[PDB]
Amino acid sequence: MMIRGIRGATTVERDTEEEILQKTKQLLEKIIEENHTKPEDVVQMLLSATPDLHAVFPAKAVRELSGWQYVPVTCMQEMDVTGGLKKCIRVMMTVQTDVPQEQIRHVYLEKAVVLRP
């Protein structure tokens, strides 16, 4: 079976642990819903944050998902683009799937709805 990336983006209003975990968790839950994703079928996840977020690693939210404790995940710093969306958390979830490239459901929540094509 083919492997496919699934993108997500969301934002927080302030650099706190509560915000980052809550919003990341909601972002992951929305992607799982739209793509019917099962954790055994997740190759890996990459989470990024803009350099104005430091309170907590977003990946901590992944363990708030029952069954996902073995999904490998790592975080990275997003580049700082002049005029770019602030306080932004992004996800690239790599999954085993038969779903055609153009039918993959990429999820944009909160202030990240402006990045969606």
Place this chain on the structure above:
Amino acid sequence: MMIRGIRGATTVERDTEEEILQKTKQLLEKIIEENHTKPEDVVQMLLSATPDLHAVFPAKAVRELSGWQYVPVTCMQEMDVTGGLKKCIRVMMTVQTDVPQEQIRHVYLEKAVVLRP
């Protein structure tokens, strides 16, 4: 048929949107040419920039490739390494392919030729 990463790297002279998109597009086009890559066979793409580039997300270049609108892509900051090549943009393009690991054609352009194997 297996999944493999394809690497690219290039540089720009000025932190401007026009040059970052021009050089990134040229890099992607060269990778596409050398590896005969179709966009539906692309699992996902990661683009990075050294911390001295801020004008635009290099991923914006991907959208000016005809047929590549559904290819998931995200950006990250390259590690800041002392004496490293400056104003550098890199790509990791993950594809489905029959080509053996030692035969994949990784691409290094402009000043990033000194990184070439």
Place this chain on the structure above:
Amino acid sequence: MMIRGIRGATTVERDTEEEILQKTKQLLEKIIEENHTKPEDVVQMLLSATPDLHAVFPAKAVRELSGWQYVPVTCMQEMDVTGGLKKCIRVMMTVQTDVPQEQIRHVYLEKAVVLRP
């Protein structure tokens, strides 16, 4: 032909090329041993460093592994988390494997042992 991420993390005491390369090599070797990984089965690898490390790209240590010269690798900056583990190097090695997700052997060494689930 399922694909799975393997995670690794380690730390160094001083920001020198010698220690970064040595600890990175040791981390990779432990991962390759625990998972029985052959370089041809590696899709790609991502390595990260916290922003307190600047001496060398950790990826340089990969070419000290005989047979690994064609494995595509790139590096990124880990996000700077307040109170986060300092001087930390991480790996996400993406591999073709039939080992189930719960049996993948992720490796945490030196001071990174605190990151284990």
